[PDB]
């Protein structure tokens, strides 16, 4: 009777953390924006536990209130939320952004993040002991570089507000815990460009990224550590990742 | 000449920097929402130096474009932009938070100053040398607290689009600076208890808070810095706030 | 065979973290400097696990280096190496602190904690894949408050060196981590108190402080981490831990 | 009259520091190892302001309590502390550095700051409003980079300190900063390859990096800030360095 509350479960992460949980028998609660990959993926996991999908755009507060509101018994009970639904876009420089792909951005990471968080905090208040908020960060909200603008202040705003709910849940027993990943090859690097799979290839060639299950069996272990535990911030790269010396502009 | 871009230049910080740019012969062209006081304060400040008043909220984008594509040719070539335009609201623990209220700060401090500096970064790079964008920041943007929730979250979205404008505007002279102060008497918290100026009372009572003109004397002189100079980001407390020690829940 | 260099394991972390490696069939090396501690752990963990125990002062680098050359063949392969071994001292404010107890504090947690990565570093890169340098943090490196002051300082470095050696290590598959604890009730406060066992209660009583078997998890958790996966930082705090308001001085 | 104890004041910050202070009528208190360096600049600044120069390598604390207590009357009364004195060595990767170059930047940056700290609060608080503790850090100290080991790590230490002891001073009025430069021209490189000249000017080569006086002029800000307000940290980059993206190992 443990229910996972999992935004963009479609693919990437989302679709990874719903057969991870589903391999330790958590009901599932899974949604997302394609409707036809949910009910793939409901079929395929159905077998398994029992599972609950909902076309949700998580950019409508009112969808994600009315979504929450009308879940069936076997599933309000909610005992973690995982806030992965999220997306980065234009990878160019600031100077050369469309504002449109900057609100796509602030309306998922920031405002789709907040608005579930809303809904699903009297529900994760009224579990209690064990209960965890997985809010995915990512490297690029602690460390700046050159085409994350928004993308990486987002992710900013996502670590500071799951410290920010830990000084407001205390003594709720509620965990709120940042996993921050690295860079992972799923379809964050396709939807960043639009649909460029050739630049989605470049990039990971020749080297070893994180895969979509070890963010996935991240999120099993952060909801599944014992109940007085907390983890404020996880920052998980790959090992053939780090940091490069200082941009210097020269003559 | 010399023009200062201030957004929310009616009260607190924006109107206190408005007077000390004019005392050094710097043009003026403030924006804000209660058109009725910037007049008030143009008719001060036309006789030191000329001033160009706007009617902006910058949560419409729209509104923000049209309004830079307005700009008078005196005025138009901004040297500095100051993003001041924000605010606070509810102090209470989140899970007591309406979700208007985390929605109207999104928009302002998020949204409206991503809509500020996107209409503005053609006008300032081509500027340059000693164009600065002065971010206002927070404390909170760094360091949680009780309360805070969605506001340091959205100082800290500030902190890091600040550092990763840095990295997209190498080569073109522009400065982007973090300018994260303290507690300070101005009219923030009336906003933030949506009208209780005795609970606005009750704090600043006893001790020595920052001054609405003393983050304008030190946004000055983020703006005067030499043009081979930038400064990430500066936290300003007053020396009689700090840190207090962990919270640790009991019986 | 698999081999851990654990430092400090004559209480605490360290002790608890050999019991936990123990029981996964981990070779054990353990260090310290309470010599009749060692060798009652070693005899409690020789029937499952062959164990070496090594008197040893972490301050000393020629002890440590001649420590590490002397290690037999069912030893010398360390894939995991937990710089556990740290102390506090004198929880008073910075001014009535004696300088010989920063000093100490300085010996052990940043001269000490480099001391062993020193004479270790060529034994973990001819390990290669799977390798772990475990460096044990504090919430105090990231988040300021009284009464740490050289403590909090010296957990700030070991933050930073983590992320430095990730710079360095690219292609050696050589993992460093940053684990930073919470409160967790050790001989921790007993030494930072110069043996007030009442201090040592009065600071854990009415709330659930962290076990030394959670940190000691945490470690063979990071240790066991696949090898293309970094942790470069993990903060865990007790649920009933956070962060306070800010501390404003006042008549 | 207005007092400063300059450590590290034989060449780079802490010399040109002198000079701006001079400029403005404060007595001066210079240390350093130099003293063909110190006797020097005594004979250029004695018309200006007394000058009274020690001989202080701030490893020893013995001889840093000593120059303390032996402070003449027009001396011992000191305004504000810049810490100054530091160092970095071998810039190769951390797998690659002798112990011994570790220690010497632990032993100065680290023991060093906290020595000349001990022994000068005291005198700091018996001032009380108006003085400053300016602990100059660095842009290492908050992002790592590959060859940076133990200096960042160093710079990270002198940032934690600087907010700690903002925690224990609250209340005396006594200010503690941390003045976080970036790339500088200031024979850093030079002592910093051990004697490589041809290394420290192709790092400045074709690009402004900070001058000594811009440092200076910036210590000079911070010490003449009203008695009321503090700067937590400000981190002063030339606006041709920045942040470049991830070190991704490949092939
Ligand atoms: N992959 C990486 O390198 C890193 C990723 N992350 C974070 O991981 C999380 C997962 O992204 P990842 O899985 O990698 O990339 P994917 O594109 O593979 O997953 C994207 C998910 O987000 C969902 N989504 C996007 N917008 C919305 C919306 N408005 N409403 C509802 N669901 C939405 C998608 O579902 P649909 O499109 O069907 O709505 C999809 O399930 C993201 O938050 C990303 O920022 C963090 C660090 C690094
Ligand atoms: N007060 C403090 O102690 C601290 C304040 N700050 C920052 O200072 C900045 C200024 O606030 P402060 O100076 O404190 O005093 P105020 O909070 O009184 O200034 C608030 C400003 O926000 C402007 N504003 C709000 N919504 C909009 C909008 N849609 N479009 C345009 N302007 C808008 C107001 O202009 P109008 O109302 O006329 O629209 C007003 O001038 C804020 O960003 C706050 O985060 C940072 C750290 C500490
Ligand atoms: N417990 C807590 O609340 C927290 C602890 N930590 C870190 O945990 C680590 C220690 O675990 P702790 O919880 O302190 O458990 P203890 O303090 O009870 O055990 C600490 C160990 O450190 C060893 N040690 C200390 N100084 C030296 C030295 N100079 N040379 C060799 N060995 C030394 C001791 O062995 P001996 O005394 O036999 O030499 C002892 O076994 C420290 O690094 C501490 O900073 C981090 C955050 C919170
Ligand atoms: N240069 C840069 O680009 C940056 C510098 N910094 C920091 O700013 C400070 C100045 O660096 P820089 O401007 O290069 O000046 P230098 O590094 O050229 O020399 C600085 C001073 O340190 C003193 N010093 C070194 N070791 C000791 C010691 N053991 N005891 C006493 N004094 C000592 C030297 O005097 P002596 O002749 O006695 O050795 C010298 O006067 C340093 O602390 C550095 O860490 C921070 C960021 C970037």
Redesign the interface.
């Given at each position: 009777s443990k229910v996972v509350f999992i935004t963009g479960a479609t693919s990437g992460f989302g679709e990874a953390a719903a057969q991870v949980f589903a391999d330790a028998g958590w009901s599932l609660v899974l949604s997302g924006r394609r409707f036809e990959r949910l009910k793939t993926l409901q079929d395929k996991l159905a077998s398994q536990v029992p599972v609950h999908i909902i076309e949700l755009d998580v950019r409508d507060?009112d969808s994600v209130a009315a979504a929450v509101a009308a879940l069936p018994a076997d599933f309000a009970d909610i005992t973690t939320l995982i806030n992965n639904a999220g997306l980065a876009l234009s990878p160019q420089?600031?100077?050369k952004?469309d504002?449109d792909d900057?609100?796509t951005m602030?309306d998922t990471n920031?405002?789709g993040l907040?608005?579930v968080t809303?809904a699903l905090?009297?529900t994760l208040?009224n579990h209690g002991a064990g209960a965890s908020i997985i809010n995915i960060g990512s490297?690029?909200?602690?460390?700046?570089?050159?085409?994350?603008?928004?993308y990486?202040?987002?992710?900013?705003?996502?670590?500071?507000?799951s410290?920010?709910?830990?000084?407001?849940?205390?003594?709720?027993?509620?965990?709120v815990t940042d996993l921050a990943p690295?860079?992972a090859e799923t379809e964050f690097t396709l939807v960043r460009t639009k649909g460029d799979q050739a630049a989605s290839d470049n990039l990971y060639?020749?080297?070893?990224p994180?895969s979509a299950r070890?963010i996935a069996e991240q999120m099993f272990?952060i909801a599944t550590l014992?109940?007085?535990?907390?983890?404020?911030?996880?920052?998980?790269?790959?090992?053939?990742?780090?940091?490069?010396?200082?941009?210097?502009?020269?003559?």
């Open positions: 507060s420089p600031a100077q952004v504002l900057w609100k602030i920031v405002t907040v608005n809303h905090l009297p208040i490297i690029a909200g602690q460390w700046p570089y050159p085409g994350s603008h928004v990486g202040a987002s992710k900013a705003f996502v670590k500071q507000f410290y920010n709910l830990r000084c407001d849940l205390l003594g709720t027993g509620v965990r690295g860079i060639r020749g080297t070893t994180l070890d272990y014992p109940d007085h535990m907390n983890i404020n911030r996880v920052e998980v790269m790959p090992v053939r990742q780090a940091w490069q010396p200082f941009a210097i502009d020269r003559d």
